[PDB]
Amino acid sequence: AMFYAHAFGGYDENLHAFPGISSTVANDVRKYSVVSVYNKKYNIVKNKYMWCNSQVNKRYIGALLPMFECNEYLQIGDPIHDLEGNQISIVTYRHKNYYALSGIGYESLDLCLEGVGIHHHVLETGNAVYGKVQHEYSTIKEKAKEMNALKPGPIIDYHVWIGDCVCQVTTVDVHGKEIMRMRFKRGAVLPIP
Amino acid sequence: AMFYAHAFGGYDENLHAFPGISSTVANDVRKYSVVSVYNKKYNIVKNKYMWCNSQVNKRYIGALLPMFECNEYLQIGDPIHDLEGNQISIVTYRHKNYYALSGIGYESLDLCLEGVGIHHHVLETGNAVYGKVQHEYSTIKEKAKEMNALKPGPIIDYHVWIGDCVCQVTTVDVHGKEIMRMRFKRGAVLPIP
Ligand SMILES: Nc1ncnc2c1ncn2[C@@H]1O[C@@H]2CO[P@@](=O)(S)O[C@@H]3[C@H](F)[C@@H](CO[P@@](=O)(S)O[C@H]2[C@H]1F)C[C@H]3n1cnc2c(=O)[nH]cnc21
Ligand SMILES: Nc1ncnc2c1ncn2[C@@H]1O[C@@H]2CO[P@@](=O)(S)O[C@@H]3[C@H](F)[C@@H](CO[P@@](=O)(S)O[C@H]2[C@H]1F)C[C@H]3n1cnc2c(=O)[nH]cnc21
Secondary structure, three states, rough: OOOEEHHHHHOOOOOOOEEOOOEOOOOOOOHOOOOEEEEEEEOOOOOOOEEOOOOOOOOEEOOOOOOOEOOOOOOOOOEEOOOOOOEEOOOEEEEEEEEEEOOEOOEEEEEOOOOOOEEEEEEOOOOOOEEEEEEEEHHHHHHHHHOOOOOOOOEEEEEEEEEEOOOEEEEEEEOEEEEEEEEEEEEEEEOOH | OOOOEEHHHHOOOOOOOOEEEEEEOOOEOOOEEEEEEOOOEEEOOOOOEEEEEEEOOOOEEEEEOOOOOOOOOOOOOOEEOOOOOOOEOOOOOEEOOEEOOOOEEEEEEOOOOOOOOEEEEEOOOOOOEEEOEOOOOHHHHHHHHHOOOOOOOOEEEEEEEEOOOOEEEEOOOOOEEEEEEEEEEOOOOOOOO
């Protein structure tokens, strides 16, 4: 099994594509509760995930990935093993002491970035979203009321909203009108560069 | 608590909107495991759902919803109760002996249909998807290569792929070239008219 890091130019379109990784195998990483890095065991976080993305050659590869808690600092490319000793992934992204387990995970977004932009936001708990902005529901409700009569235009930007209780993807036209919204019913965090 | 069926002209833009229903309340229906219709108890199916949608005023309202198994024929508008006599929903959609429990559910898709169409397909287990078609993976891999060069045009159609092991949403241009792919890691069925 080979795992190549996109952060080091390892992207290969003819290989399986996951956030941060081009691989010769497609491992279902949802099935692991414990992982090992340099012979140290780390527990997978239950019911909270990490939204990770790589962006190569105008291709956006995003997905909610499992994550394990590790107080030690790990670097991009460190091999991740199961308890039997098989390498299942490489270290890609971290949020403080959370590290993404990159592979076939939960909800995913694959997008061609030609002519559009994509932006990621931490969704504050209880806030609503309209288009490219979040705020309190009362502020959002009226923003929606005034943007309603606008004739929708073509999508020009995607916005990914990652919250503790829900995740969402929205799209907007040039005027900021919300064209489409998808929700994922999972809680997660975004990587911290 | 009022539940109005979109099928009977019950859509109210100022009410909460769910597949087939406009309601004065917003019930989280993921929590119920048993419901009651006309004083008969029915079990909610575990780990499999129903993708349901209504389309009103150029608005698409789709969601993955819980379903309960019931051999009696039920009709749109039949009140659905919890085990404490509280009404929580109304019958909207059916798949053979599966009946949707509409409300706040799992993954959702909200879309302004202005200028675009949307289509739903039963994803055959083990089939792959590119753009507007499903087929065996090797055939799909070839279709992707043939469409690889074609210049990406405006999104004109959404396609909802509902399978036993995964659900997906794709967007395509006029040629059928794939713009976006979103995966929902849930199994589900589609209503049968
Ligand atoms: N009328 C309101 N009065 C006061 N506060 C409101 C109202 N509406 C929304 N908020 C607030 O805004 C946030 C975003 O909610 P949102 O639309 S993104 O979706 C939410 C989440 F997926 C989940 C709960 O989310 P939560 O409670 S932690 O946060 C909410 C809340 F804090 C259920 C979804 N859900 C809620 N209502 C509908 C609906 O009618 N249709 C489809 N799904 C719906
Ligand atoms: N290379 C291949 N060789 C042979 N057959 C293949 C290959 N690729 C796909 N198929 C077939 O097509 C179906 C849909 O696959 P899809 O693209 S929707 O993604 C699938 C589903 F989400 C989940 C279960 O699907 P399942 O196993 S029952 O069916 C598959 C399979 F029958 C695993 C996901 N998954 C697989 N690989 C990747 C990847 O590289 N990235 C992100 N997710 C990936």
